[PDB]
Amino acid sequence: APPIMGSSVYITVELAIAVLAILGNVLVCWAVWLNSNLQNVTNYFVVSLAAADILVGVLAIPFAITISTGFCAACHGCLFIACFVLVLAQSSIFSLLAIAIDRYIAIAIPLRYNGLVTGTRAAGIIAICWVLSFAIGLTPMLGWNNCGQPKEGKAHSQGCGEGQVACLFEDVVPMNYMVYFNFFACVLVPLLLMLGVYLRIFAAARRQLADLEDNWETLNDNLKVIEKADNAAQVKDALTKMRAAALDAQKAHGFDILVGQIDDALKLANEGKVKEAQAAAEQLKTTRNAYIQKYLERARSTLQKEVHAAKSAAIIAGLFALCWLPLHIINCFTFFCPDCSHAPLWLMYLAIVLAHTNSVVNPFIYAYRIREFRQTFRKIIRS
Ligand SMILES: CC(C)CCC[C@@H](C)[C@H]1CC[C@H]2[C@@H]3CC=C4C[C@@H](O)CC[C@]4(C)[C@H]3CC[C@]12C
Ligand SMILES: CC(C)CCC[C@@H](C)[C@H]1CC[C@H]2[C@@H]3CC=C4C[C@@H](O)CC[C@]4(C)[C@H]3CC[C@]12C
Ligand SMILES: CC(C)CCC[C@@H](C)[C@H]1CC[C@H]2[C@@H]3CC=C4C[C@@H](O)CC[C@]4(C)[C@H]3CC[C@]12C
Ligand SMILES: CCn1c(=O)c2c(nc(/C=C/c3ccc(OC)c(OC)c3)n2C)n(CC)c1=O
Ligand SMILES: CCCCCCCC/C=C\CCCCCCCC(=O)OC[C@H](O)CO
Ligand SMILES: CCCCCCCC/C=C\CCCCCCCC(=O)O
Ligand code: NA
């Protein structure tokens, strides 16, 4: 068929994706810029990622449309057209890894997270990540390209001038770079690191929930022990275990009452006043129902929240992988199997369109899983 027809379908889909990418990610940026409840370190990496997607629509997709035509161009200019999307993809990877690490710090060490992770260092990290993304993505421009061995015939058939080439991705970008350097080292390794980080996150959260329920169970079971005890030494056993568990749970003003009441009962148990020690320990039920239950519930709620936020971040990371892996896998076949027939052109553009689609989904994930983003989107739209 006349190449323009299939091209028209590919171009039309690309432009539609560009519109949606720009609109959605501009909305994310606007939401963070207005709402102070969304202005944190985590959402600063979210904005860095949104900027990458905005640039995908404004530059990467136009570049992709351009390089699909095979227009005559200087090989190094064609190279920039081809590799700029690699810059944006690498920036996305760094932002995703930063979010994963930020969440891990938030749950692993909630105490020092406020001082360890701050917005100033975050801005510096984002800057560095963009510089390294330009370095990685544009590494072919430094010499790892196929400009030294142009396809002279394909340049003459299209009437390209002296020093020009038919600007085609696989003609100028080496495939060993895309497979070994870009995919394996710069895409797959970071993603597997993110996987390990999120496993540590969820493992931690599960362990802390188990610790909370364990401390609640021990506090009630030793209460039963104190009830049915028969001598002062046994009451002392249960209470000593209690006191340690109390100063323990305090770490991860009502507790003051608790530990104090344990001390009262423990002193009276040391005086051989068994009976009055169970009464003094039975006072603990009051402190538990009014103070230790509320703490258990509030803490469990906060950890469930951290799990939810981590799940949202992992969803976006996984969607990034889902959208980009097909193109990388096609490159692996093009590189590792020269005996295989190259992936058909329609499948190539389907994979490119999918990678680009990734720049549209993140705003939707925010709106469907994060209430603050959802409500801010609503306010912006209604106005
Ligand atoms: C800040 C933003 C808006 C600036 C964007 C500038 C972009 C579009 C510019 C910067 C460098 C430019 C390229 C430089 C050299 C060549 C080789 C030539 O044979 C064809 C055009 C081509 C491939 C240019 C296309 C346009 C280009 C990519
Ligand atoms: C999916 C995540 C976990 C890891 C990525 C796995 C990738 C690197 C794997 C999955 C399937 C693999 C391909 C399966 C089959 C072939 C055909 C063979 O003649 C050359 C190697 C090649 C082309 C493999 C290269 C590596 C490959 C693309
Ligand atoms: C869900 C994501 C992560 C994985 C998707 C895997 C996709 C990209 C895989 C599944 C089957 C694969 C195809 C299987 C066979 C061939 C024929 C060969 O001559 C060229 C490559 C080509 C056309 C492969 C391209 C990549 C392919 C389409
Ligand atoms: C690094 C991410 N990536 C890619 O990895 C990539 C790609 N285009 C191709 C390949 C395009 C292509 C391959 C064979 C063709 O003809 C046989 C062809 O003709 C238009 C285009 N590849 C491998 N693009 C879009 C510019 C891309 O972004
Ligand atoms: C901040 C927002 C600003 C918006 C910025 C707009 C986005 C860039 C658009 C297109 C770049 C790709 C188009 C490059 C086409 C080159 C065609 C050309 O030069 O053709 C000559 C021919 O090949 C003889 O050799
Ligand atoms: C945000 C949506 C994007 C809108 C911007 C317009 C898209 C531009 C894309 C491609 C322009 C084609 C450039 C001309 C290449 C030379 C063609 C040739 O000589 O064969
Ligand atoms: Na992205």
Residue numbers in the entry: 0 to 208, 1001 to 1043, 1063 to 1106, 219 to 305
Which statements did the authors publish about this structure?
ID29, a flagship beamline of the ESRF 4th generation synchrotron, is the first synchrotron beamline in the world capable of delivering high brilliance microsecond X-ray pulses at high repetition rate for the structure determination of biological macromolecules at room temperature. The cardinal combination of microsecond exposure times, innovative beam characteristics and adaptable sample environment provides high quality complete data, even from an exceptionally small amount of crystalline material, enabling what we collectively term serial microsecond crystallography (SµX). Here we describe the first comprehensive application of serial microsecond crystallography (SµX) at the new ESRF-EBS beamline, using sample delivery methods already established in SX - fixed target, either on foils or Silicon (Si-) chips, and HVEs. SµX was used to determine the room temperature structures of three classic targets (proteinase K, thaumatin, and the lysozyme-GlcNAc complex) and a human integral membrane protein, which belongs to the large family of G protein-coupled receptors (the adenosine receptor A2AR - co-crystallised with Istradefylline).
